[PDB]
């Protein structure tokens, strides 16, 4: 009538090969002595031998304050009614902190089945000598979809923040790495892991910044859970029998992970970064002040477009950043988690200080255009013959545009670097096209006075490039057919604009111009970055940096000669452009289909432990732009007495 | 030595009052006969009497294919280390479909504790005669945070979609209502419920549209889970002892819910809606064709701004809609779920057809301005004296702006109505300010020819209103201090613009103008809607609809007389404005802090079972705008012979 019930004492680190049926329940009693200042983990492992799909085993682990249960072989789900079946299951047991200095704690394991056949299982309860993580010591382990793991880290003395870096040398088991507090239970299942805490799907890398003020116990759990399907990490899926009713044996895929918890930049990294920024971008101001005191003693549309954008920029990103602030789902903003230093609510504060160069060099330029205009008007009371003939008609209206577009760049990008994304991308790099545009009009608008009608001619072209990026944005991972057709339609524009400016060197002019477009084509074809609007920016400068040379070479072959004061700004502008494009090309693939794949491109800080490569791009770009404004400005200053060459140049 | 183990037969619908200690385990054996075409639910209920916090009961329900376990009193968590403790727990048992026509199925209940004191519990397994929901029949039930519930709905014959409407006559227990398939297990816990399926947090209402193609079993589970804290529904929290270590007794709060699953519009509602739209908006075209054949026989900035917006509009919302498409978290887009008819990937397709009036009446207007220009130029070959003196200088350049801004409105709003939101709001209503702006310039630019300098004067003002909405957007739930200070700064603008146009009626002019601003102030102060940019739109038309009257009243007191052809468009424009503002004011509070609160304002469809109030607003607004363009156009057609009154009017 009544079932057998076998109660038997058991021991740690000793494997039991028993069996149960529908008329048999096995109960094992384990005990262990726990101590306050040395915590251990108890990991139960079950494994059924050559089991038929009739009816599973039912395993219950009973502790003083918790009941855990599962059924073996454990069945997990897929997307489209796909079941995966695991013969072997494991769990680390959650247990609350011990109230005494040391106490004996019992727990029980209960094995029962409702199938009428002898089912042979294999049980083993082991003690983990590696449960407590250490600061600065790599630790490696294994996990599968039926064997989730978790470890404990407790903060050292006086360390107020850490970063947990987890790495894997192989791509496709997926994973979720959650960071939870040390209160039982622990949510280490495919459906519990995203309930609370802050987490990150990985493929090869994950990195999470943790601070004490979120964990009043001064400790937390790092939880690793492997997933049954790799779609969330950019992987494909097969199904030969998978969609059928029966489950699919999937116990053959493991993930081998390494975890390292290391201290973060304490506080003086922030001071060093701020002092570096201020020093380098005020050296320019001091240099200009001394330069002036030496040498002297020897419109609304651009702002409104940004204003009618910045508020949508401010509102969109803030409404989008707050999710990770409250949800902990860190697969939403595409930071560089290995170099991302929080301040207040900002996650990557260093990716915002970097945009101080645009602000403070777009403001130093406006203080040059203003000083040139004022000085020129202070000359107009003396009435020298150089009104507009002995020199060139001064049109600062589009200088002010250049000096104020550089300012808005240090706000469109500083606000974009709050949660970089795909929907969020167009704010920063697309507005550098404007500066690229204005740097082209000047050299045209210098040899052609009545170009105010042509000023609006280029305004139409700028939206097309934004539309072209938008057209590329419509399919961010578009096929080659999009890429090559855009590549070939690029090829037409090579000779198309070359004809506008066109005599031996003009036939030589076609040599370097067409090559670069052809050169830049292949590096696009072979790579095809997910980021396209950033790609075309490179074509922007490369043609722009070429077109300076053309204006010089034609000027090189006249009686007009280049003075050093507007020449020393040509070599240094090109040197900084060379460096700036090096760090620009470092991060160009570091944005891909999914955050898991976009995260295996992260890399540590470089400068003062604070700034990465993309911060060094915000630095050199704002100096190259400013270094190019003074080229357009000073270049033709030797023509302060000539009225024939300047007038009949074009 | 070994524990007692009591195995005892049990019965449904009969309560057991037993006790266990650390040396006693109780096991109850239940059985029940299940049948294929009649499914029942088995609900286990446990309740501990006057239990001390020493060590809980541990309850295990063991079935053939599933093990369920919990611990009583059950502890749930809060946000800031807050624990809530429930003495009574209940679960409905998941069970896979029976393979035979009828079979006997056993399950077991296992009660055990590790505390050394007699703990007295109360167990009851009951059978539910109300597990299978029916189509079109309200069903009411109770639930708490420790007693989650779920019911089964199986599709009737030939019904391809249903809507599940759940309602509660009281606000603050929160809830999550998930819709899952009928494969075990069921995720009805505070941490499982959001794993899969599509769900909705409610406060008083929820409504979810379900389609067979997602559920190949032709059935699903409606799962209701009550939450321990009401922050996600806009509620506050107390904590007198709550933040302390001990848990808080919280078994005193219930939620009483009603569930109704009703069939959705089959297919001809879509046909009726499309036919209605086409008929009403082509009656205008046919009417104009007959009107012309009767009577005759008797620039880039506006598009570029939208183009540099529409692509960000298209990209942002599409990148934002796809989340609910793949996540099922329907607390992301602020639809009207009671009237939201899907088509393809679009969730609310009727909120897009409604924007056909802007497209097809912004296009019919451009075919009037074009015909007036062509006819006028076909007259300029005859050279009548009415070039610009006997009439008024024709400036269609800003007519084209009006006729093309109405077109872009039917795309900015049609794209906004793909996931209405807070970040997403500015796209639709802010661009109706432009049409409101251009409707003001015409009457000004008719009495003042050289107003091209004043054309850009108002362009600055438009961004300020957008900035004012943005300033209001920065704190969407801002305090009164924002609201009243903006209200009083409004009061200055009352007399400020009144002075611009200013004689007895001009002193009367101050009567109605200031009152409306004062009138519109209180209805803002008393209500203070979360939607502010939509509020100021009302102030937009109200002043705009007033300023038409002023131009008439001054015209009413001259020798100039109003012909009926430009008068019959004045009464009908005002009638449609009156109706349009009625349906506009229906949905004005239907957007609040949280989607749960924003959803208790939903209301059923009105017209042809397809269009709600806000669709009737897209309909009447596009006819009122068009009805106002023909006022600005035809009004002063009687001045086709006068050159004194027109010239010296202003
Ligand atoms: C707690 O468990 C330990 C096992 O880890 C028990 O110690 C064993 O007791 C059995 C009883 O005969 C024998 O195998 C040995 O005496 C012990 N083996 C080892 C490896 O220590 C211990 O008795 C248990 N304590 C209680 C109170 O049950
Ligand atoms: C994690 O799993 C890997 C894969 O099984 C283990 O590496 C293997 O260990 C066995 C034991 O001798 C051998 O087959 C080889 O040494 C390893 N095979 C390889 C690397 O292909 C590894 O030992 C497991 N444990 C850890 C901590 O990594
Ligand atoms: C299945 O459970 C039912 C109870 O629902 C059992 O029927 C009862 O059996 C006990 C045994 O003495 C008595 O209370 C009555 O004979 C029955 N009561 C009722 C209300 O039916 C039944 O015996 C069980 N079947 C098996 C095979 O165990
Ligand atoms: C749901 O819970 C409510 C609240 O307890 C129940 O309504 C009460 O029922 C008891 C039973 O007689 C009485 O106190 C009153 O009839 C009700 N009190 C009220 C309405 O304040 C209700 O019966 C429960 N069940 C359902 C299906 O609603
Ligand atoms: C288990 O039950 C069987 C009855 O089938 C009987 O051998 C005895 O009661 C139990 N066995 C032992 C070893 O106690
Ligand atoms: C800390 O643990 C060690 C382990 O040997 C032992 O001295 C004792 O259990 C604890 N002592 C203190 C001072 O915490
Ligand atoms: C150790 O735990 C026991 C529980 O039985 C209890 O007496 C107390 O918490 C601790 N012992 C002492 C002497 O404090
Ligand atoms: C295995 O089955 C045999 C009979 O087939 C019987 O001895 C018992 O059910 C099982 N043996 C065990 C549990 O040792
Ligand atoms: C329960 O165990 C006790 C020993 O404390 C003893 O009465 C007997 O073995 C069991 N009771 C019954 C009624 O079988
Ligand atoms: C359906 O259920 C009824 C219940 O009385 C019974 O006729 C039988 O179990 C089933 N019959 C068919 C035809 O499915
Ligand atoms: C009913 O279930 C039993 C399980 O014991 C099995 O014989 C079969 O699935 C069904 N019976 C028949 C006669 O088909
Ligand atoms: C209640 O406790 C008494 C002794 O305090 C003992 O009879 C047994 O543990 C409990 N009584 C039951 C289970 O009937
Ligand atoms: Zn950047
Ligand atoms: Zn609308």
Residue B290 CA to residue B103 CA, distance in Å, equals 76
Cα pseudo-dihedral B385, B386, B389, B393, rounded to 10: -140
Distance CA A441, CA A431 (A): 16
- For residue B58, the cross-strand partners are B71, B112
CB A573 within 8 A of CB A552: no
Expressed in angstroms, the distance from the first to the final Cα of chain B is 110
Nearest Cα to Cα of residue A632 among A539, A555, A569: A569
Total Cβ atoms within 10 A of residue B127: 12
Taking the CA of residue B266 as centre, how many other CA atoms within 13 Å lie in the half-sphere pointing to its CB? Answer: 3
Identify which of A596, A536, A496, A511 has the alpha carbon closest to the alpha carbon of residue A175.
Answer: A596
**Distance (Å) from CA A428 to ligand 13 centroid:** 7
Residue entry with tokens 């006086």: A158
Instruction: Give SS3 for A46.
Output: strand
Residue of the nearest CA to atom 12 in ligand 6? A37
- Resolution of the experimental model, in Å, one decimal: 2.9
> What distances in angstroms separate CA B35 from CA B97, B107, B125, B129, B132, one per listed residue?
9, 16, 19, 14, 14
Distance CA B4, CA B1 (A): 9
Which ligand 11 atom is at minimum distance from the Cα of B99?
Answer: 9
Rounded CA gap, A98 and A538, in Å? 61
Distance separating the N- and C-terminal Cα atoms of chain A: 110
Asked if B412 and B401 count as a contact pair (C-beta separation under 8 A), the reply is: no
Establish whether residue A100 lines the binding site of ligand 7, counting it when its CB lies within 6 angstroms of any ligand atom. yes
Give the mutation candidate from A195, A215, A472 for the B interface (greatest B CB count, under 10 A). Answer: A195
Helix axes B504-527, B533-556, angle to 10 degrees: 160
Q: Given CA atoms B365, B371, B372, B374 in this order, what sign does their dihedral have?
A: positive
The rounded distance, in Å, linking the Cα atoms of A434 and A537 is: 11
Using DSSP, state whether A95 is helix, strand or coil.
coil
At A245, give phi and psi (nearest 5°): -70, -45
Query: Measuring from atom 26 of ligand 3, which residue has the nearest CA?
Result: B31
Whether A310 and chain B come into contact, CB under 8 Å, resolves to: no
At A212 the three-state DSSP class reads helix
**Which residues in B133-252 belong to E strands, given as ranges?**
139-143, 149-154, 161-167, 175-180, 198-202, 205-211, 219-226, 248-249
- For residues A585 and A538, what is the distance between their CA atoms, to the nearest angstrom? 9
Query: Would the CB atoms of A466 and B308 count as touching at under 8 Å?
Result: yes
Q: How far is CA A135 from each of CA A129, A164, A341, rounded to the nearest angstrom?
A: 16, 10, 19
What is the CATH topology of the domain spanning B132-236+252-264? Jelly Rolls (2.60.120)
Residues touching ligand 1 (Cβ under 6 Å) are: A 9, 11-12, 31
Q: Does ligand 3 lie within 6 Å of residue B35's CB atom?
A: no
- In the reported structure, the alpha carbon of residue B100 is separated from the centroid of ligand 11 by a whole-number distance in angstroms of 7
In 3D, which of B150, B180, B144, B188 has the Cα closest to residue B166?
B150
* CB spacing of B3 vs A7 below 8 angstroms: yes
Residues B533/A311, Cβ–Cβ less than 8 Å:
no
Cβ of B31 less than 6 Å from ligand 3? yes
Answer for the pair A206, A599: CB distance below 8 angstroms, yes or no: yes
Residue A650 CB neighbour total at 10 angstroms: 11
Provide the pairing of β-strand A24-35 with A4-9: parallel
CA separation for the pair A52, A554 (Å, rounded):
85
Give the Cα separation of A261 and B629 in Å (integer).
67
Q: Which tokens in the block code for residue A599?
A: 């995260």
**Using an 8 Å Cβ cutoff, are B66 and A75 in contact?**
no
Sign of the C-alpha dihedral, residues A606, A612, A618, A620? positive
DSSP character at residue A476: T
Listed in sequence order, the residues at least 6 apart from A296 whose beta carbon sits closer than 8 Å to its beta carbon are none
Q: Which residues pair with A74 in a beta bridge?
A: A86
Q: Which of residues 568-587 of A touch B (CB under 8 A)?
A: none
- Burial of A552 from C-beta contacts in 10 A (0-12 / 13-18 / 19+): middle
Residue in B232, B223, B222, B249 with CA at minimum distance from that of residue B174: B232
Token pair for A451: 């170009």
CB A428 within 8 A of CB A412: yes
d(CA A486, CA A474) in angstroms, rounded, equals 14
Q: Is B190 on the interface with A (CB under 8 A)?
A: yes
- Dmax of chain A from CA atoms? 121
Sign of the Cα torsion A596, A600, A606, A608 reads: positive
CA of B13 to the centre of ligand 3 (A): 13
Distance from CA of A238 to the nearest CA of B (A): 20
Q: Given its phi and psi angles, is residue B635 left (phi above 0), alpha (psi -120 to 50 degrees) or beta?
A: alpha
Partners of residue B60 on adjacent β-strands: B69, B110
Scanning A237-299, the segments in alpha helix (DSSP H) are: 268-295
A422 CB neighbours in chain B (<8 A) are 315, 319
Our CA-based measurement puts residue B7 at a distance from the nearest CA of chain A, in whole angstroms, of 7
What is the CATH number assigned to the segment(s) A132-236+253-264? 2.60.120.380
* From B62, B181, B187, residue closest to A191, measured CB to CB: B187
d(CA B121, CA B26): 11
Task: Give the Å distances, CA to CA, from B156 to B133, B179, B432.
Answer: 11, 17, 46
Q: Can you say how many angstroms the Cα of residue B247 is from the centroid of all Cα atoms in its chain?
A: 38
Q: Among B228, B215, B187, B209, which Cα is nearest to B86's?
A: B228
Helices B356-379, B268-295: axis angle to 10 degrees equals 10
Question: Using CA atoms, how far apart are residues B98 and B104, in angstroms rounded to an integer?
Answer: 10
Same fold, B1-129 and B132-236+252-264: yes
Query: Which residues, 6 or more positions from B645, have their beta carbon under 8 angstroms from its beta carbon?
Result: B558, B559, B560, B639
How far is the CA of B139 from the CAs of B133, B204, B339, B423, in angstroms?
8, 16, 22, 38
Q: For A6, which DSSP code?
A: E
| Block residue for tokens 């979120």 | A214
Distance, CA of B543 to CA of B215 (rounded, Å):
53
Residue A391 CA neighbour count, 13 Å, CB half: 17
B114 contacts A63? CB cut-off 8 A: yes
How many C-beta atoms surround the C-beta of residue A444 within 10 A? 17
Q: Report how far residue B133's alpha carbon sits from residue B139's, in angstroms, rounded to the nearest whole number.
A: 8
Phi then psi for residue B55, to 5 deg, are: -150, 135
Joined tokens for residue A632:
């357009």
Distance in angstroms (rounded) separating the CA atoms of residues B48 and B281: 68
Residues whose CB is less than 8 angstroms from the CB of residue B51 and which lie 6 or more positions away in sequence, other chains included:
B57, B72, B73, B87, B119
Q: Which residue intervals of A501-594 are DSSP H helices?
A: 504-527, 533-556, 568-586
Within a 10 A sphere around the Cβ of A257, how many other Cβ atoms?
Answer: 23
Mutation test of the interface with chain A: which of B59, B95, B178, B311, choosing the one with the most A Cβ atoms within 10 A? B311
**CA distances (Å), A262 to each of A142, A160, A163, A225, A259, in order?**
21, 11, 5, 22, 10
Q: With beta carbons less than 8 A apart as the criterion, state whether B405 and B431 touch.
A: yes
Give dist(CA B368, CA B630) in Å, integer: 9
Using a CB-CB distance cutoff of 8 angstroms, which residues of chain B are in contact with residue A305? 305, 308
**Coil, strand or helix at A122:** strand
Helix A452-474 with A480-500: angle, nearest 10 deg: 170
Longest dimension (CA), chain B: 121
Closest CA to A221 of A168, A148, A169, A138: A148
Q: How many CB atoms lie within 10 A of CB A507?
A: 9
Residue A17: strand, helix, or coil: coil
For Cα atoms A92, A95, A101, give the angle at the middle one, nearest 5 degrees. Answer: 130
- What fold does the segment set A1-129 form as a domain? Jelly Rolls (2.60.120)
Task: Tell me the chain B residues in contact with residue A304 when contact means C-beta distances shorter than 8 Å.
Answer: 459-460, 463
CA distance B363 to B382: 30
Facing residue for A315 by CB, picked from B300, B315, B423: B423
CA-to-CA distance for A185 and A275, rounded, in angstroms? 46
- Cα A607 to Cα A612: distance, rounded to the nearest angstrom: 7
Q: Are A300 and B460 in contact (CB under 8 A)?
A: yes
CA distance B176 to A208: 30
- Taking CA–CA distances from A78, the nearest residue in chain B reads B196
Q: Which of B368, B344, B225 is nearest to B292 (CA)?
A: B368
Give the whole-angstrom CA distance, residue B100 versus residue A285: 87
- Asked whether the beta carbons of B592 and B598 are under 8 A apart, the reply is yes
* CB pair distance less than 8 Å for A320 and B66: no
B423 neighbourhood in chain A, CB within 8 Å = 315-316, 319-320
Selection from B164, B198, B165 nearest residue B181 by Cα: B198
Q: DSSP string of A486-518?
A: HHHHHHHHHHHHHHHT--HHHHHHHHHHHHHHH
Interface probe, candidates B9, B23, B71, B457, chain A, greatest A C-beta count within 10 A: B71
Q: Which residue from B38, B98, B101, B102 has its CB within 8 A of the most atoms of ligand 10, so it is best to mutate?
A: B38
A71/B56 Cβ within 8 A: no
Q: Where are the domains of chain B?
A: 1-129, 132-236+252-264, 268-477+530-637
Helices (H), B328-422: 350-353, 356-379, 397-416
Of B60, B81, B463, which is closest to A308 when you measure between CB atoms?
A: B463
**Percent helix, percent strand, percent coil in chain B, to nearest 5:** 40, 20, 35
A549's tokens: 């040379």
Query: Is B75 within 8 Å of B85 (Cβ atoms)?
Result: yes
Strands B24-35 and B4-9, by their bridges, are parallel
Q: Does B232 contact chain A (CB < 8 Å)? A: no
The angle formed by the CA atoms of residues A320, A323 and A327, to the nearest 5 degrees, is 165
What does the block give as tokens for B590?
């239907």
Asked whether the beta carbons of B171 and B245 are under 8 A apart, the reply is: no
Tell me which residue has its CA closest to atom 1 in ligand 2: A142
Asked if A384 contacts A375 with a C-beta cutoff of 8 angstroms, the reply is no
Exposed e or buried b per residue across B42-69, where buried means at least 16 C-beta atoms within 10 angstroms of its C-beta: bbbebbbeebeeebbbbbbbbbbbbbbb
- Token pair in block for residue B555: 């015209």
Residue of A nearest to B193 (CA): A191
- Measure CA B487 to chain center: 27
Compute the radius of gyration of chain A from its Cα atoms: 33
Distance CA B211, CA B162 (A): 7
Which ligand is in closest contact with the Cα of B64?
A: 11
Q: Percent helix, strand and coil across chain A, each rounded to 5?
A: 40, 20, 35
CA dihedral A379, A381, A386, A389 (to 10 degrees): 130
State phi, psi for A531 to the nearest 5 degrees.
Answer: -85, 110
For residues B424, B427, B430, B432, the Cα torsion angle rounded to the nearest 10 degrees is -140
Residues with CB under 5 A from ligand 14 (ion): B 413
**Residue B335 has what DSSP assignment?**
-
How far is A148 from A125, CA to CA, in rounded Å?
Answer: 15
Please state whether beta strands B83-86 and B248-249 pair in parallel, antiparallel, or not at all (unpaired).
parallel
Which residues does chain A have within 8 Å of residue B466's beta carbon, measured at their own beta carbons?
308, 311
Which H/E stretch holds residue A175? Answer: strand A175-180
Ligand closest in space to the Cα of A33: 1
Residue B114 touches chain A, beta carbons under 8 Å: yes
Kindly write down the DSSP assignment for every residue of B66-110, as one continuous string.
Answer: -EEEEEESEEEE-SSS-EEEESEEEEEPP-PPPSSSEEEEEEEEE
Running DSSP on this structure, what letter comes out for residue B3?
A: P
Q: In what order do the strands lie in the sheet with B102-113?
A: B4-9, B24-35, B102-113, B57-62, B67-72
Q: How many residues does chain A have?
A: 650
Question: How far away is chain A from the Cα of B604, in angstroms, using its nearest Cα?
Answer: 30
Q: Answer for the pair A403, A373: CB distance below 8 angstroms, yes or no.
A: no
Cβ atoms B65, A55 nearer than 8 A: yes
| Closest listed residue to residue B89, CA positions, set B191, B232, B201, B189 | B189
Which residues in chain A have Cβ-Cβ distances shorter than 8 Å to B68? 69
- Residue A254 near residue A144, CB atoms below 8 Å: yes
Give the tokens for residue A189. 């299942």
Cis preceding-peptide flag for A185 (omega within 30 of 0): yes
Cβ–Cβ gap A470/B311 under 8 Å = yes
- Among A104, A137, A128, A126, smallest CA distance to A41 is for A128
Breaks (C-N over 2.5 A) in chain A follow: 298, 502
Closest CA to A491 of A509, A518, A528, A467: A518
What kind and span of H or E run contains A261? strand A255-263
Q: Do A67 and B81 touch (CB under 8 A)?
A: no
Half-sphere exposure of residue A453: CA atoms within 13 angstroms, side-chain side: 3
The SS3 of residue A390 is coil
**Cα B628–chain centre separation:** 29
Give me the residue label for tokens 């794993």: B195
Chain-centroid distance, C-alpha B423: 14
Which residues face A343 on adjacent strands?
A: A346
- Whether A387 and A641 have beta carbons less than 8 Å apart is answered as no
A176 near A227, Cβ under 8 Å?
yes
Please say whether the beta carbons of A498 and A509 come within 8 A. Answer: yes
């Amino acid at each position: 009538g009544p079932k057998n019930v076998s109660q038997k004492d058991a021991e740690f680190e000793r494997t039991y090969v028993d069996e149960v049926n529908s008329e048999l329940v096995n109960i094992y009693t384990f005990n262990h002595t726990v101590t306050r200042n040395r915590t251990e983990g108890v990991r139960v492992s079950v494994n059924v031998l050559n089991k038929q799909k009739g009816a599973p085993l039912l395993f219950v682990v009973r502790q003083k304050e918790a009941v855990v249960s599962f059924q073996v072989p454990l069945i997990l789900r897929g997307m489209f009614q796909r079941k995966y079946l695991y013969q072997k299951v494991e769990r680390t047991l959650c247990q609350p902190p011990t109230k005494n200095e040391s106490e004996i704690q019992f727990f029980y394991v209960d094995v029962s089945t409702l199938s009428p056949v002898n089912t042979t299982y294999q049980l083993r309860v082991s003690r983990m000598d590696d449960f407590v993580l250490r600061t600065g010591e790599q630790f490696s382990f294994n996990t599968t979809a039926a064997q989730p793991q978790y470890f404990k880290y407790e903060f050292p003395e006086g360390v107020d923040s850490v970063i947990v870096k987890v790495t894997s040398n192989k791509a496709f088991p997926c994973s979720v790495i959650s960071i939870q507090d040390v209160l039982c239970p622990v949510y280490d299942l495919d459906n519990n892991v995203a309930f609370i805490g802050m987490y990150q799907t990985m493929t090869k890398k994950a990195a999470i910044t943790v601070q004490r003020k979120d964990f009043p116990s001064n400790s937390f759990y790092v939880v690793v859970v492997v997933k049954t399907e790799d779609q969330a990490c950019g992987g494909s899926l097969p199904f030969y029998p998978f969609a059928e009713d029966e489950p699919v044996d999937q116990g053959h895929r493991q993930k081998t992970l390494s975890v390292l918890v290391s201290q973060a930049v304490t506080s003086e990294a922030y001071v060093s970064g701020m002092l570096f920024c201020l020093g380098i971008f005020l050296s320019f101001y001091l240099l200009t002040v001394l330069l002036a005191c030496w040498e002297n003693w020897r419109f609304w549309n651009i702002a409104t477009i940004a204003v009618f954008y910045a508020l949508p920029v401010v509102q969109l990103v803030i409404t989008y950043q707050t999710v990770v602030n409250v949800t902990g789902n860190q697969d939403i903003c595409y930071y560089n988690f290995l170099c991302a230093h929080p301040l207040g609510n900002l996650s990557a504060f260093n990716n915002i200080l970097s945009n101080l160069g645009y602000i403070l060099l777009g403001l130093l330029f406006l203080l040059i255009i203003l000083q040139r205009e004022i000085n020129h008007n202070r000359a107009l009371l003396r009435n020298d013959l150089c009104a507009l003939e002995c020199g060139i008609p001064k049109h600062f209206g589009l200088f002010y545009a250049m000096g104020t577009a550089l300012m808005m760049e240090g706000l469109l990008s500083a606000c974009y670097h709050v949660c970089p994304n795909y929907t969020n991308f167009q704010f920063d790099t697309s507005f550098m096209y404007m500066i690229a545009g204005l740097c082209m009009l000047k050299l045209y608008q210098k040899r052609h006075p009545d170009i105010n009608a042509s000023a609006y001619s280029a305004y139409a072209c700028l939206a097309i490039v934004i539309f072209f990026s938008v057209l590329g944005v419509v399919f961010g991972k578009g096929n080659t057919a999009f890429w090559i057709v855009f590549s070939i339609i690029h090829i037409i524009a090579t000779l198309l604009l070359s004809t506008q400016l066109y005599y031996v060197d003009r036939m030589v002019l076609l040599v370097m111009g067409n090559v670069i477009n052809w050169s830049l084509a292949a590096y696009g074809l072979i790579m095809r970055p997910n980021d396209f609007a950033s790609y075309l920016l490179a074509i922007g400068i490369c043609n722009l940096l070429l077109y300076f040379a053309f204006y010089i070479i034609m000027k090189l072959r006249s009686g007009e000669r280049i003075k050093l004061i507007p020449l020393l700004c040509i070599v240094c502008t090109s040197v900084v452009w060379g460096f700036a494009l090096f760090f620009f090309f470092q991060g160009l693939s570091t944005w891909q289909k999914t955050p898991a794949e976009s995260r295996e491109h992260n890399r540590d800080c470089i400068l003062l432990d604070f700034f990465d490569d993309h911060d060094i791009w915000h630095f050199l770009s704002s100096i190259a732009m400013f270094g190019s404004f003074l080229v357009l400005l000073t270049l033709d200053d030797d023509l302060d007495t000539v009225q024939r060459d300047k007038i009949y140049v074009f």
